[PDB]
């Protein structure tokens, strides 16, 4: 018992659907460093999002493929974490230490930037204007302490400095994973799909048209772990499709791959950084800059810095940084997403509102025109419906916002031959424009908010009702007390599968046991059948009580 209790947090056991068509349990070793690298909040945050997107989008067949891609991304993420854990020689070592500090403190710098934005805008709450220096207006702070203006200047400079630090931290932390995913997907497409060999991407695949740049660059599989994807693509493409053509497409030489296949000695790089600057891959660097200058998070950070720099032209541009709280907390981001969740429907419903209001404008322009004299002055009339453009603006602006329709802001239809005509016109405007269509817009956004929150709650509920791997619901497991808990923690645990993947990676191929070699070959061939689907050890040996 004591040995079992000591090695319990190191004994990871997963069940695989083996070659015998049976669910068989594999007991491997979880490294202490591997578990510690799984249990930081960043990796947990990565798993949290992965589970959210997989459960939301769906797809039982693609579930295991997305799980494996997530495992690869998270392995590379903790490789980044391991690298960032804790005169040119001094200059480079100090540079890498400073970039390390930024990369570890990326989130703390984000919180600091938001705190600085809040403080700056709190100072800006004291801004006033006057015609006299602190036809010409002067915008000055009115503070009795006299320190809020130097504090405002200092906080503005500190905030743009933190903006610099946040973009550098993002470039050193999150950009490598984006490049890793891009290189991985390009390598998978070339190896399996063979798109640049056979199925050339179209104009809609701007991603592919940009990926065409790193087809021939020597640093194509740089961020991606596999370095011989070019040779693999030559092996399965070029025998049929032209070996010289595929070599030209991949930017590699047949004699070079022959001399690397033969016994060869690797030389040393020339000393100095002036050779490196001449050895930078221009095309691959341009491709990397292109794939990070369209990444949405980096674009948000660049916009954040643009706003920070504009905050030095005018300090009120610092108010744009308060949206960072909406980008930060979850359900405020959900409120912002609900605006565009039914965006097409909202655009065409406000188009219908514009059309129907335009119809009310034509019928209040040809008729019902003397009832738009908004000016109470007798000598100066302000007829809003003498021009079609002015009447349409008046309607869409004032009548839509009015809760009782256009009858609130038009002259009373009493003692006039058009009395019932204007009564019907105002009632139908108040009914269709105000009562119905505006509340349909309200529904299209509020029900979108409720639907997004319901999707989040449904994701959380579904996970606790079915096993992510075998799918079997909690009803079959809860027959035994704490059944699902045991099954989804010791029988099929998402992490345990990740730890098996790492154990296969770092174990030598000459040591993999039959089960491990089977799983390894399955992973190489990208089949994903070793995951148990629709069955588990309990289901297989239900009669044998195991």
Ligand X SMILES: CCCCCCCC/C=C\CCCCCCCC(=O)O[C@@H](COC(=O)CCCCCCCCCCCCCCC)COP(=O)([O-])OCC[N+](C)(C)C
Per-residue burial over 289-304, b if 16 or more Cβ lie within 10 Å, else e, is: eebbeebeebeebeeb
Q: How many CB atoms lie within 10 A of CB 228?
A: 12
Ordered alpha helix ranges (H), 224-372? 229-236, 243-250, 254-261, 276-279, 282-292, 296-313, 324-328, 330-341, 343-366
Toward its own copies, which CB reaches closer, 254 or 348? 348
The C-alpha atoms of residue 407 and residue 429 are separated, in whole angstroms, by 9
Examine residue 82 and tell whether it contacts ligand X (CB under 6 A).
no
Binding residues among 268-307 for ligand X as defined by CB under 6 A: 286, 289-291, 293-294, 296-297, 299-300, 302-303, 306
Residue number with the smallest Cβ distance to ligand X: 343
Per-residue burial over 190-210, b if 16 or more Cβ lie within 10 Å, else e, is: bbeebebbeeebeeeeeebee
Flag whether 32 is marked binding. no
Q: Which of 126, 140, 520, 523 binds ligand X (CB under 6 A)?
A: 126
- Is the Cβ–Cβ distance between 298 and 228 less than 8 Å? no
Only one of the segments 40-48, 136-144, 145-153, 344-352 lies at the binding site for ligand ATP (rule: CB under 6 A); that segment is 40-48
Binding residues among 316-335 for its own copies as defined by CB under 8 A: 316, 319-320, 322-323, 325-326, 329, 331-332, 335
Residue 194 interface partner, choices Zn ion, ligand ATP, ligand X, none, CB cut-off 5-8 Å depending on type: none
Residue 504 interface partner, choices ligand ATP, Zn ion, ligand X, none, CB cut-off 5-8 Å depending on type: none
Flag whether 46 is marked binding. yes
Cα→Cα distances 116→119, 121, 145, 163, 168, Å: 5, 9, 20, 11, 18
Examine residue 99 and tell whether it contacts ligand ATP (CB under 6 A).
no
Binding residues among 494-513 for Ca ion as defined by CB under 5 A: 510
Helix axis angle for 41-57 and 60-83, nearest 10°, is 160
Q: Which of 397, 465, 541, 542 binds its own copies (CB under 8 A)?
A: 397
- Is the Cβ–Cβ distance between 224 and 72 less than 8 Å? no
Sign of CA dihedral 169, 170, 171, 173: positive
Only one of the segments 101-109, 273-281, 371-379, 460-468 lies at the binding site for ligand ATP (rule: CB under 6 A); that segment is 460-468
Q: Which of 310, 335, 402, 504 binds ligand X (CB under 6 A)?
A: 310
What is the DSSP secondary-structure string of 310-351?
A: HHHH-GGGGGGGGGHHHHHSHHHHHHHHHHHHTHHHHHHHHH
Query: Using CB under 8 A as the criterion, what x/- string covers residues 149-188 for binding its own copies?
Result: ----------------------------------------
- Is the Cβ–Cβ distance between 357 and 433 less than 8 Å? yes
Residue 467 interface partner, choices Zn ion, its own copies, Ca ion, none, CB cut-off 5-8 Å depending on type: Zn ion
Only one of the segments 39-47, 100-108, 167-175, 404-412 lies at the binding site for its own copies (rule: CB under 8 A); that segment is 404-412
Residues that bind ligand X (CB under 6 A): 126, 128, 139, 142-145, 157, 160-161, 164, 204, 206-207, 210, 286, 289-291, 293-294, 296-297, 299-300, 302-303, 306, 309-310, 312-314, 316-317, 319-320, 327, 339-341, 343-344, 346-347, 350, 354, 359, 362-363, 366, 387-390, 396-397, 400, 415-417, 419-420, 423-424, 427, 431, 441
Binding residue positions for ATP: 44-48, 463-468, 488-494
């Amino acid at each position: 018992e004591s040995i079992l209790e000591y090695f319990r947090p190191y004994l990871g056991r997963i069940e695989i659907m083996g070659a015998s068509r049976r669910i068989e349990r594999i007991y491997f070793e979880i490294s202490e460093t591997n578990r510690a690298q799984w249990e930081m909040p960043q990796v947990k945050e990565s798993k949290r999002q992965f589970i959210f997107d997989v459960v939301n989008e769906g797809g039982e067949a693609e579930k295991m493929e997305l799980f494996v891609s997530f495992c690869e991304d998270t392995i590379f993420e903790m490789q980044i974490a391991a690298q960032i854990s804790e005169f040119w020689g001094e200059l480079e070592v100090q540079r890498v230490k400073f970039l390390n500090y930024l990369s570890r403190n990326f989130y703390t710098l984000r919180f600091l930037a938001l705190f600085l934005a809040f403080a700056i805008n709190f100072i800006l709450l004291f801004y006033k204007v006057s015609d006299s220096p602190p036809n010409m207006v002067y915008y000055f702070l009115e503070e009795s302490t006299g320190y809020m203006e130097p504090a405002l200047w200092c906080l503005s400079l500190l905030h743009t400095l933190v903006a610099f630090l946040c973009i550098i931290g993002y470039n050193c932390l999150k950009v490598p994973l984006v490049i890793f995913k891009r290189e991985k997907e390009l390598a998978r497409k070339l190896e399996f799909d063979g798109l640049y060999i056979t199925e050339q991407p179209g104009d809609d695949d701007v991603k592919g048209q940009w990926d065409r740049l790193v087809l021939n660059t020597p640093s194509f599989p740089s961020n991606y772990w596999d370095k011989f994807v070019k040779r693999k693509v030559l092996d399965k493409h070029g025998d049929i499709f032209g070996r010289e053509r595929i070599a030209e497409l991949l930017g590699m030489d047949l004699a070079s791959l022959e001399i690397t296949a033969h016994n060869e000695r690797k030389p040393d790089p020339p000393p100095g950084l002036l050779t490196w600057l001449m050895s930078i891959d221009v095309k691959y660097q341009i491709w990397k800059f292109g794939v990070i200058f369209t990444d949405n998070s980096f674009l948000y950070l660049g916009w954040y810095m643009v706003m920070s720099l504009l905050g030095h032209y005018n300090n009120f541009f610092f108010a744009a940084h308060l949206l960072d709280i909406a980008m930060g907390v979850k359900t405020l981001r959900t409120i912002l997403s609900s605006v565009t969740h039914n965006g097409k429907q909202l655009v065409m419903t406000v188009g219908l509102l514009a059309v129907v209001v335009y119809l009310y404008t034509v019928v209040a322009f040809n008729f019902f025109r003397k009832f738009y004299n908004k000016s109470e002055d007798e000598d100066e009339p302000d007829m809003k419906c003498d021009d079609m453009m002015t009447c349409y603006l008046f309607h869409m602006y004032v009548g839509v916002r009015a809760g009782g329709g256009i009858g609130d802001e038009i002259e009373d239809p009493a003692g006039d031959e058009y009395e019932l005509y204007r009564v019907v016109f105002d009632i139908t405007f108040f009914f269709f424009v105000i009562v119905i269509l505006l509340a349909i817009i309200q529904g299209l956004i509020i029900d979108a908010f409720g639907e997004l929150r319901d999707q989040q709650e449904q994701v959380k509920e579904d996970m606790e009702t079915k096993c992510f791997i075998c799918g079997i619901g909690s009803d079959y497991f809860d027959t035994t007390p704490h059944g699902f808990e045991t099954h989804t923690l010791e029988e099929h645990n998402l992490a345990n599968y990740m730890f098996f993947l790492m154990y296969l990676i770092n174990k030598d191929e000459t040591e993999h046991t039959g089960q491990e070699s089977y799983v390894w070959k399955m992973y190489q061939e990208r089949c994903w059948d070793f995951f148990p689907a629709g069955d588990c050890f309990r289901k297989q040996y239900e009669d044998q009580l195991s």
